[PDB]
Structures are given as C-alpha cells and as structure tokens.
Amino acid sequence: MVLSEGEWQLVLHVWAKVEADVAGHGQDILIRLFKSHPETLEKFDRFKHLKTEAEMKASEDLKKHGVTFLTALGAILKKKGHHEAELKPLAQSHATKHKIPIKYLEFISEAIIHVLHSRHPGNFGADAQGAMNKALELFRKDIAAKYKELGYQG
Numbered sequence: 001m002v003l004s005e006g007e008w009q010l011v012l013h014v015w016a017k018v019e020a021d022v023a024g025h026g027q028d029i030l031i032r033l034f035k036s037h038p039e040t041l042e043k044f045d046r047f048k049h050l051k052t053e054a055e056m057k058a059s060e061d062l063k064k065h066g067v068t069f070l071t072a073l074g075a076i077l078k079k080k081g082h083h084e085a086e087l088k089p090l091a092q093s094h095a096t097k098h099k100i101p102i103k104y105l106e107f108i109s110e111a112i113i114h115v116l117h118s119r120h121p122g123n124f125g126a127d128a129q130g131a132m133n134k135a136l137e138l139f140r141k142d143i144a145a146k147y148k149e150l151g152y153q154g
C-alpha cells in the first residue's frame with residue numbers, strides 16, 4: 001500500500017509530540033497492551049511475573065523496553081515507507097527468537113492508537129488516526145511478508 005505525503009505528515013506531526021517523552025509513552029502503551037491482552041505479557045520472559053499495573057509502572061526493565069521498541073518504531077515511521085532495511089533484522093528476531101504472531105502486532109497497534117488518542121486529542125483527530133492506522137497496517141503487511149520469507153507463521 002502507499003501513503004500520500006499528506007498522510008505521512010499527519011503521522012510525523014503527532015509522532016514529534018510522542019518524542020517529547022519517549023519513556024512515558026513506551027510505558028503507557030505496554031501497560032495498555034498487557035492490561036487489554038494479558039496473554040501478550042507471557043512473551044516477555046523478563047517481566048512475565050509482574051502482577052499489577054502498579055508493579056508494571058515501577059519496573060525499570062519494562063520502561064527500558066518501552067524506549068527500545070518505541071525508538072525502533074519511530075525510526076521506521078520516519079522512513080515514510082522506505083523501510084526495507086530497517087525491517088529485516090526486526091522481522092528476523094520477532095519471527096525466529098521471540099515468536100510474535102501477527103495478531104499481537106495488531107494488539108499493540110491498537111494500544112498505540114489508544115494512547116495517542118488519550119494523550120494528544122488535538123493532534124489526533126479522525127484524519128490523523130486514519131493516517132496512523134494506515135502507517136501501522138503498512139508496517140504489519142511488510143513484516144508479515146518478511147515473516148513468510150523467513151519460514152514463520154506463514
């Protein structure tokens with residue numbers, strides 16, 4: 001699929017706001033994901049044990065991963081679609097080492113959209129959400145094709 005420059009603009013305009021606090025958005029998003037879809041916390045051998053949202057908020061490791069994953073996503077979105085190089089090592093490690101099904105990438109895309117909507121209502125109206133959703137669907141479709149080339153999930 002292909003986004004128009006206008007759509008990339010809306011995505012990078014609200015992302016510039018997220019970047020003012022990467023560790024805070026990374027936490028919110030992961031907690032939203034784990035509270036909504038608790039089965040996803042099982043994939044993390046380092047935090048699996050956390051039982052509550054308070055314990056999640058206080059975990060430094062969880063916050064460190066939030067910064068790690070969000071930074072990578074930000075580096076992919078900034079490419080505006082030209083992200084083949086970036087995707088390769090990510091698809092390999094999520095398909096062979098972590099084993100993250102496409103369905104989970106859809107769950108975290110819903111978490112990203114829930115948090116941006118909460119924190120940035122003004123910069124995340126309907127058109128800006130439609131664009132963000134398109135950019136994440138583009139990210140999932142390319143990762144899913146790479147997963148098939150790599151022998152995973154199919």
Ligand code: HEM
Binds near residue numbers: 069072093098100105
């Ligand atoms: C927006 C999509 C996502 C991005 C950009 C992303 C990015 C990353 C990055 C950069 C790392 C570190 C390097 C590596 O191992 O590849 C990582 C590790 C990891 N990611 Fe993902 N990720 C995404 C979605 C997910 C989801 C949905 C899950 C699980 C339900 C997941 C599970 C993990 C796990 C288990 C590790 C290892 C963490 C630790 O042991 O240090 N990722 N991810």
